[PDB]
């Protein structure tokens, strides 16, 4: 009789799964960001639809209604601080015209690629999951991290993770062991 | 008579004006041997 821990789905499959226009649209997104499966596009198009639906029901409400003013400015603050909107489009009429690629641009593996450090978009993903890139001071290995605007300048290599110094990996260690017993003497 | 049916409706969509793939020797075969 403990309280049931609430859960909910974070993705929704499309009603029309087979259309050549959309199948090529989502595959274009998958290649240029390096997405493992189509759930990643499904997940973004789910929460994007939730943001648009919430903001759409605010727009039916009249001006200066404090429910619209409080919830609306909350929704503008959350999207700008993440970075989806710019600072010049802080209105409810612009969040309806958001695009899926705006959210994917704010990911971690997309942002670590835009900051050098990757040399390809697929190398950006596989670097992160090997526990190399640390946001601020804490090591992350989640490619859907959704880097905030303030944590943009703190993305570097961890004090661990041999690309940032500190005792290179086991493959080089066995290599250093082999040339120590062969070429060292 | 599955091969007779599949050809019969296929030139009907020539006259209706829609795309349809041109054929070969798999037209009236079980594409999948079942379970």
């Amino acid at each position: 009789p403990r309280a049931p821990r609430t859960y909910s789905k974070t993705y929704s499959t499309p009603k029309r799964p087979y259309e050549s226009s959309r199948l090529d649209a989502e595959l274009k997104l998958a290649g240029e960001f390096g997405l493992k499966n189509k759930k990643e596009i499904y997940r973004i198009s789910f929460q994007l639809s939730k943001i648009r639906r919430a903001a759409r029901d605010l727009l039916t409400r009249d001006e200066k209604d404090p429910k619209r003013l409080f919830e609306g400015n909350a929704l503008i603050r959350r999207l700008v601080r993440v970075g989806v909107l710019s600072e010049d489009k802080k209105k409810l009429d612009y969040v309806l015209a958001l695009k899926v690629e705006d959210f994917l641009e704010r990911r971690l593996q997309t942002q670590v690629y835009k900051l050098g450090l990757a040399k390809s978009v697929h190398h950006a993903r596989v670097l992160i999951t090997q526990r190399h890139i640390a946001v601020g001071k804490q090591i992350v290995n989640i490619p859907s991290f959704m880097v905030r605007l303030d944590s943009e300048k703190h993305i570097d290599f961890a004090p661990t993770s041999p690309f940032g110094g500190a005792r290179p990996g086991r493959v080089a260690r066995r290599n250093a062991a082999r040339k120590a017993e062969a070429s060292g003497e | 008579s599955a091969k007779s049916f599949i050809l019969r409706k296929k030139e009907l969509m020539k006259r209706r004006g829609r795309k349809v793939a041109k054929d070969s020797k798999f037209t009236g075969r079980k594409r999948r041997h079942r379970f």
Partner: protein, 47 residues
């Protein structure tokens, strides 16, 4: 055919799987399209 009793403790090299498989489709589908006939065919036989 039978599973080994202690197993749980032509050939073509395998396709990549997961994220790297989508990299193969994106290269194959449209970056540097291989066969072009004006309508972008996808599976020919003997040409």
């Amino acid at each position: 055919k039978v599973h080994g009793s202690l197993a749980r403790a032509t050939e073509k090299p395998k396709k990549p799987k997961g994220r790297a498989y989508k990299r193969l489709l994106y290269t194959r589908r449209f970056v540097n399209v291989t066969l072009v006939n004006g309508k972008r065919r996808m599976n020919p036989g003997p040409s």
